[PDB]
């Protein structure tokens, strides 16, 4: 399959394939997203959630959050893809997390990128300055954080002021991945994903992991597209059978514009290819990605 990656790469036709995917991609309506009352719950005019897969808030004033429930029946895995919270949807974001019983949050942007804020400071930065969202009646405390060269693994305690309940949310922050860009390498990327897997945030015992970026379509799409494909190869009895193009189109049935650049699409291929080695076997000395990642 890997040489199959070159032939497309020798032809340098990725832009051709990516535009085909863009053309063949599903086109469902987003009536709720475009309602006037929700003009200010959306970071971008052009990224909105389909009405059919959009997450809904159990609150009764408005139920709109720019979040989509991607559910992959064949792989058995679901993710919640969403935009980077805004100054006013931060309580919605953690409300979404709490209601959906999500255990992990995957952040693929940085609050500030290229001199502009793409996201909100929606998690407290100091153990002593807990955050409290009055509208959704939630309180968020920072517990402990592990910082690596390119990612950070915070540990948050989200608590419901109403029921008095509390949960441990894991925060996986990829701090070096730039908008429309690609991770420094597949080794760096695979390292990250596999850390998310082991935390159990992805296990069906919990809600769906929440994955986001500035708009939660480009970098996040590459994340799930890599994750889901690898998930399939261990399942189908012919790991070569996985069609990366087919899978991306399937996700685009739940959220628009997953994967934002022909390059991102290309990297997605490499990550599965390099990651397939772990799934496939990975020599007589696995754990290699741990060494090659350059974490600290």
């Amino acid at each position: 399959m890997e040489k199959e990656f070159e032939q497309i790469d020798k032809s340098g036709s990725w832009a051709a394939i990516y535009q085909d995917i863009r053309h063949e991609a599903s086109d469902f309506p987003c009536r709720v997203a475009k309602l006037p009352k929700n003009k200010n719950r959306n970071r971008y005019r052009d990224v909105s959630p389909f009405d059919h897969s959009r997450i809904k808030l159990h609150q009764e004033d408005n139920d709109y959050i720019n979040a989509s429930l991607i559910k992959m029946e064949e792989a058995q895995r679901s993710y919640i893809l969403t935009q980077g919270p805004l100054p006013n949807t931060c309580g919605h974001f953690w409300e979404m997390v709490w209601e959906q019983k999500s255990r992990g949050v995957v952040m693929l942007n940085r609050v500030m990128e290229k001199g502009s804020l793409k996201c909100a400071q929606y998690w407290p930065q100091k153990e002593e300055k807990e955050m409290i969202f009055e509208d959704t009646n939630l309180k968020l405390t920072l517990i402990s954080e592990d910082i690596k060269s390119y990612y950070t693994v915070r540990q948050l305690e989200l608590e419901n002021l109403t029921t008095q309940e509390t949960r441990e949310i894991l925060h996986f922050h990829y701090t070096t991945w730039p908008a429309f860009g690609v991770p420094e390498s597949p080794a760096s990327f695979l390292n990250f994903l596999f850390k998310v897997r082991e935390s159990g945030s992805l296990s069906p015992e919990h809600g769906p992991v929440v994955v986001h970026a500035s708009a939660g379509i480009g970098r996040s799409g590459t994340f799930c597209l890599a994750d889901t494909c690898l998930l399939l190869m261990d399942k189908r009895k012919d790991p070569s059978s996985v069609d990366i193009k087919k899978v991306l189109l399937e996700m685009r049935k739940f959220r628009m514009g997953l994967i934002a650049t022909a390059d991102q699409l290309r990297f997605s291929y490499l990550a599965v290819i390099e990651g397939a080695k772990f799934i496939m076997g990975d020599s007589s000395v696995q754990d290699q990605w741990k060494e090659l990642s350059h974490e600290d």
Binding site: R43, Y44, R45, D46, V47, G218, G257, A260
Partner: peptide, 6 residues
């Protein structure tokens, strides 16, 4: 600014 792709 208000668009994600340009």
């Amino acid at each position: 600014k208000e668009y994600y792709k340009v």
